[PDB]
Amino acid sequence: AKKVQAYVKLQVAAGMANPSPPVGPALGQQGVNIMEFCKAFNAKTDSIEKGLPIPVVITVYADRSFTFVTKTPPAAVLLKKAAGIKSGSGKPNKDKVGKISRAQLQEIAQTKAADMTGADIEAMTRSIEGTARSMGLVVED
Amino acid sequence: MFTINAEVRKEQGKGASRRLRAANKFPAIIYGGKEAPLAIELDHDKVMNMQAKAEFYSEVLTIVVDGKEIKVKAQDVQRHPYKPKLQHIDFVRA
Amino acid sequence: MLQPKRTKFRKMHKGRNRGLAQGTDVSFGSFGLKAVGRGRLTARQIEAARRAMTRAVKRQGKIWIRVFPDKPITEKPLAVRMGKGKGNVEYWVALIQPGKVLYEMDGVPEELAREAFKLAAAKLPIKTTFVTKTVM
Amino acid sequence: SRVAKAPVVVPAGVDVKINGQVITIKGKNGELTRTLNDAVEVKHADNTLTFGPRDGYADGWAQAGTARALLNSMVIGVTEGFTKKLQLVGVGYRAAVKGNVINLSLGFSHPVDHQLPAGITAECPTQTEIVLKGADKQVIGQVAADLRAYRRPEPYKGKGVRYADEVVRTKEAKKK
Amino acid sequence: DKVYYHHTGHIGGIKQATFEEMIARRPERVIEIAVKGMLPKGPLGRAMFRKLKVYAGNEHNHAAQQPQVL
Amino acid sequence: MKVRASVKKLCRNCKIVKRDGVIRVICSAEPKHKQRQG
RNA sequence: GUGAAGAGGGAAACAACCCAGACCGCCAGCUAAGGUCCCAAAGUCAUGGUUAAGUGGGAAACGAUGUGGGAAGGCCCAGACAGCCAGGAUGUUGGCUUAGAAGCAGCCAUCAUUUAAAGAAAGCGUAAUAGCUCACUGGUCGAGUCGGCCUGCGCGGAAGAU
RNA sequence: GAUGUCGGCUCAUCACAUCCUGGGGCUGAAGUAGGUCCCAAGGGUAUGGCUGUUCGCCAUUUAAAGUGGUACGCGAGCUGG
Numbered sequence: 001a002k003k004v005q006a007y008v009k010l011q012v013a014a015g016m017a018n019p020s021p022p023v024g025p026a027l028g029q030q031g032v033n034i035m036e037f038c039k040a041f042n043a044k045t046d047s048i049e050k051g052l053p054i055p056v057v058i059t060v061y062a063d064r065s066f067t068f069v070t071k072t073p074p075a076a077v078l079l080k081k082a083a084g085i086k087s088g089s090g091k092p093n094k095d096k097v098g099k100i101s102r103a104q105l106q107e108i109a110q111t112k113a114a115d116m117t118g119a120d121i122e123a124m125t126r127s128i129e130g131t132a133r134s135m136g137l138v139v140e141d
Numbered sequence: 142m143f144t145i146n147a148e149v150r151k152e153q154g155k156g157a158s159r160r161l162r163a164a165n166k167f168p169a170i171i172y173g174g175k176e177a178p179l180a181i182e183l184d185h186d187k188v189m190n191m192q193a194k195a196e197f198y199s200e201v202l203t204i205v206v207d208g209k210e211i212k213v214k215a216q217d218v219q220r221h222p223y224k225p226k227l228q229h230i231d232f233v234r235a
Numbered sequence: 236m237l238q239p240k241r242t243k244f245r246k247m248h249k250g251r252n253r254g255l256a257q258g259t260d261v262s263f264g265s266f267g268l269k270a271v272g273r274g275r276l277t278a279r280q281i282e283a284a285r286r287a288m289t290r291a292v293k294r295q296g297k298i299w300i301r302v303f304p305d306k307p308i309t310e311k312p313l314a315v316r317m318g319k320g321k322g323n324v325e326y327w328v329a330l331i332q333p334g335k336v337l338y339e340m341d342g343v344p345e346e347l348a349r350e351a352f353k354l355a356a357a358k359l360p361i362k363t364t365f366v367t368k369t370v371m
Numbered sequence: 372s373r374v375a376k377a378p379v380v381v382p383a384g385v386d387v388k389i390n391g392q393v394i395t396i397k398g399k400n401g402e403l404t405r406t407l408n409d410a411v412e413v414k415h416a417d418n419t420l421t422f423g424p425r426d427g428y429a430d431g432w433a434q435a436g437t438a439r440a441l442l443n444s445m446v447i448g449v450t451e452g453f454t455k456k457l458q459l460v461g462v463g464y465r466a467a468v469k470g471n472v473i474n475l476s477l478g479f480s481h482p483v484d485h486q487l488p489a490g491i492t493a494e495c496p497t498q499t500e501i502v503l504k505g506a507d508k509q510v511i512g513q514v515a516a517d518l519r520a521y522r523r524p525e526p527y528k529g530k531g532v533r534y535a536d537e538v539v540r541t542k543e544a545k546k547k
Numbered sequence: 548d549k550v551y552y553h554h555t556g557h558i559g560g561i562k563q564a565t566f567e568e569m570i571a572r573r574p575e576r577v578i579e580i581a582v583k584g585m586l587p588k589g590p591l592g593r594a595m596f597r598k599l600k601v602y603a604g605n606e607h608n609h610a611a612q613q614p615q616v617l
Numbered sequence: 618m619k620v621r622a623s624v625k626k627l628c629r630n631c632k633i634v635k636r637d638g639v640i641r642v643i644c645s646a647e648p649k650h651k652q653r654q655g
Numbered sequence: 656g657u658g659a660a661g662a663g664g665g666a667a668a669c670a671a672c673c674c675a676g677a678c679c680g681c682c683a684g685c686u687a688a689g690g691u692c693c694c695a696a697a698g699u700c701a702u703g704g705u706u707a708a709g710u711g712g713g714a715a716a717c718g719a720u721g722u723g724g725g726a727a728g729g730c731c732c733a734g735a736c737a738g739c740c741a742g743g744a745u746g747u748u749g750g751c752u753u754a755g756a757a758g759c760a761g762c763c764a765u766c767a768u769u770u771a772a773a774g775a776a777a778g779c780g781u782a783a784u785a786g787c788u789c790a791c792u793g794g795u796c797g798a799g800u801c802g803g804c805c806u807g808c809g810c811g812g813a814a815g816a817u
Numbered sequence: 818g819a820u821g822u823c824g825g826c827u828c829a830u831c832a833c834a835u836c837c838u839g840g841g842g843c844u845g846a847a848g849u850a851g852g853u854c855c856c857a858a859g860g861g862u863a864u865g866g867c868u869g870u871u872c873g874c875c876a877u878u879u880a881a882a883g884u885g886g887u888a889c890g891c892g893a894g895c896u897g898g
């Protein structure tokens with residue numbers, strides 16, 4: 001569709017940053033200041049769940065300065081924790097690697113709510129269920 | 142119901158018939174009952190489109206010949222060897 | 236290699252060779268492929284055509300065959316004139332305009348018929364089907 | 372039907388004229404004529420112009436379309452001033468102008484100077500860019516290609532003067 | 548699209564061919580060429596062709612019979 | 618390649634196949650690919 | 656049936672094919688086959704229509720939006736066909752796999768939200784993302800537009816030696 | 818009541834279904850070299866070993882060593898293997 005520099009997105013661990021392969025060169029190309037972001041990101045990430053991969057969208061200016069919004073962790077990840085599993089099924093739907101109660105999905109839907117378009121909770125719950133079915137994660141009501 | 146216009150034939154034989162279908166007018170027949178068989182000359186490029194249906198060979202039809210009535214059905218159907226064209230058509234009276 | 240004919244007993248022999256007249260019309264499947272115009276439908280021709288129907292398509296339904304060769308077609312080598320009437324070995328069906336294809340399960344009726352029409356020497360229209368209604 | 376052609380305004384500068392068949396236009400740009408086909412019967416009330424097909428003959432009706440358009444472009448050219456530019460890519464490739472003789476240093480042993488016809492000059496805003504521009508869209512087109520033609524872009528790289536629009540990225544991967 | 552085809556004589560399979568739009572060196576030739584053949588063919592019709600006078604340039608060197616005309 | 622007779626046209630974006638009888642399957646708008654009259 | 660054992664007229668030329676059977680003479684008429692622009696006798700004839708290739712004036716399978724005619728259908732002034740403008744979103748970078756695989760190496764799945772519309776995506780592209788175009792939809796413009804059926808005439812296929 | 822065979826020599830002339838050279842399209846075409854198809858007949862298109870050979874194989878050249886028609890061109894022109 002469309003893909004240009006400026007306003008980068010990336011999912012980095014809660015309290016960790018600065019490695020070159022994961023970070024560095026990614027936004028580094030854009031003109032971002034690695035160090036500042038590393039310390040800056042992990043600062044707030046302390047309050048935000050530590051140990052939880054959280055996607056952040058950095059937007060740089062002509063100033064080369066930048067800001068970033070920390071949202072909620074990915075649905076797939078949240079489903080993994082909830083399921084208590086480390087990974088997806090490889091062949092989702094064919095083989096189920098884990099399960100999650102309908103209650104849990106509502107909880108994840110609630111967590112992601114801020115980032116989700118869902119008009120009502122059912123809508124949200126079901127956006128996440130869509131991810132679960134893609135993960136080989138069954139849901140028992 | 143299906144309505145097919147037509148009229149009696151002038152002649153009936155090789156030359157005659159062959160001359161009708163050669164102008165979109167395959168000669169058909171109508172028999173059954175006490176009424177003497179009827180030899181007409183329907184309009185080809187107008188009946189082949191109507192036979193197009195599956196209804197044609199089930200529900201009776203109304204052939205407007207001369208200006209009278211008849212209410213009949215389709216019996217035998219002679220079609221061209223390879224041309225989608227149609228030919229002699231048998232009509233079972235009521 | 237296929238051979239729709241051969242498979243007869245050995246006697247009765249071969250000979251004659253005439254011209255033709257009018258065609259014929261059959262009916263066995265949901266879709267048929269009829270030819271229009273006399274030509275030589277040799278065994279080899281007929282197998283090539285039919286065999287080309289499945290042609291990595293599907294084994295769905297079942298195809299037919301109304302046409303069937305009648306060998307009696309002699310040829311001679313690099314030899315003298317009328318010293319006998321050398322063997323035949325070749326084939327020939329001698330059609331006019333009959334129907335000879337037919338399809339069981341619908342599927343890709345007309346489609347396939349065309350995907351394999353060139354093998355035949357004569358020209359055959361898309362044709363239609365056993366009917367008492369029509370198409371278009 | 373779904374197509375035709377009827378409009379052709381005659382604002383200021385638009386001093387169209389017809390001489391039986393001939394049509395000479397004027398304006399801020401230049402003097403362009405274009406005697407159409409024979410049946411042609413174009414005129415001018417006060418603003419709208421209109422082609423004239425002697426009659427509804429096959430090669431007579433469509434002869435209108437190609438006509439109601441050509442003249443129109445003559446108007447759109449005379450009033451706006453036509454422009455079109457190409458860009459040169461590849462090491463060594465350069466650009467330069469000296470009135471007409473647009474010296475070209477592409478990649479041959481010696482550079483050349485394409486002399487452009489009259490009615491359309493060109494300017495190299497840099498040794499890499501060339502922007503031709505004139506009135507008559509005809510001489511415009513031919514010289515647009517007549518130039519890039521000096522070295523058509525090759526897939527493996529793209530090098531070679533190209534229109535400043537040519538989608539052609541590069542090649543399909545090489546091989547042997 | 549139409550040639551005339553002459554073939555000289557000295558073989559070497561030269562065989563000359565020229566189209567009509569290619570007739571710029573001597574347009575006078577044509578017409579005279581066409582008008583020919585349609586003659587009795589032979590002596591009479593042979594010394595009968597000259598009664599044409601080619602001329603390719605309207606009222607020019609009408610001297611061929613400048614005196615009287617119609 | 619540029620054929621002699623007619624190999625249809627195939628593909629979608631191939632030329633309109635219109636002109637002085639120019640078939641050759643290919644599918645223009647293939648910056649490199651260009652199977653056609655030649 | 657003709658030539659043989661048949662001449663005259665026609666098919667350029669041409670025993671056999673088409674017309675037609677030469678008893679003589681005629682600077683007299685009508686016709687047959689075939690013809691009527693010139694060679695070359697007689698319509699540069701008339702009423703209408705086809706073709707645009709010199710077809711007529713050599714040749715097939717098959718191919719093609721050539722152009723003529725006839726019939727039946729698909730969408731459409733609740734706006735179609737081409738174009739122009741605008742959008743094309745969210746869970747989600749789907750799961751796996753992989754150094755990476757984020758619509759677009761590959762395998763599996765291909766749901767659901769928001770909707771006027773929005774494929775877990777059609778091609779290009781990146782190391783992977785970024786970016787470009789596509790499906791779809793809204794506005795614009797306002798009338799046909801898109802194929803097959805049967806048939807007329809035509810085009811390509813079509814290379815040879817004085 | 819005679820139209821002298823194959824091959825060679827001499828000397829040819831045409832075709833194009835082109836071998837070299839000339840101009841193009843695609844390529845699984847980087848370049849160099851090629852592959853293939855279109856166009857093109859202006860001109861050019863090998864010396865020997867073996868064999869009667871045509872041909873062929875082999876040695877060595879060449880930009881290349883074209884295919885074919887001409888009573889398988891050519892004996893009132895040569896040869897006679």
Ligand SMILES: [Mg+2]
Pocket residue numbers: 587588
């Ligand atoms: Mg004479």
Ligand SMILES: [Mg+2]
Pocket residue numbers: none
């Ligand atoms: Mg005798």
Ligand SMILES: [Mg+2]
Pocket residue numbers: none
């Ligand atoms: Mg008379």
Ligand SMILES: [Mg+2]
Pocket residue numbers: none
């Ligand atoms: Mg006369």
Ligand SMILES: [Mg+2]
Pocket residue numbers: 712
């Ligand atoms: Mg001809």
Ligand SMILES: [Mg+2]
Pocket residue numbers: none
């Ligand atoms: Mg050639």
Ligand SMILES: [Mg+2]
Pocket residue numbers: none
């Ligand atoms: Mg030798």
Ligand SMILES: [Mg+2]
Pocket residue numbers: 889
């Ligand atoms: Mg000889």
Ligand SMILES: [Mg+2]
Pocket residue numbers: none
């Ligand atoms: Mg001697």
Ligand SMILES: [Mg+2]
Pocket residue numbers: 897898
């Ligand atoms: Mg001897």
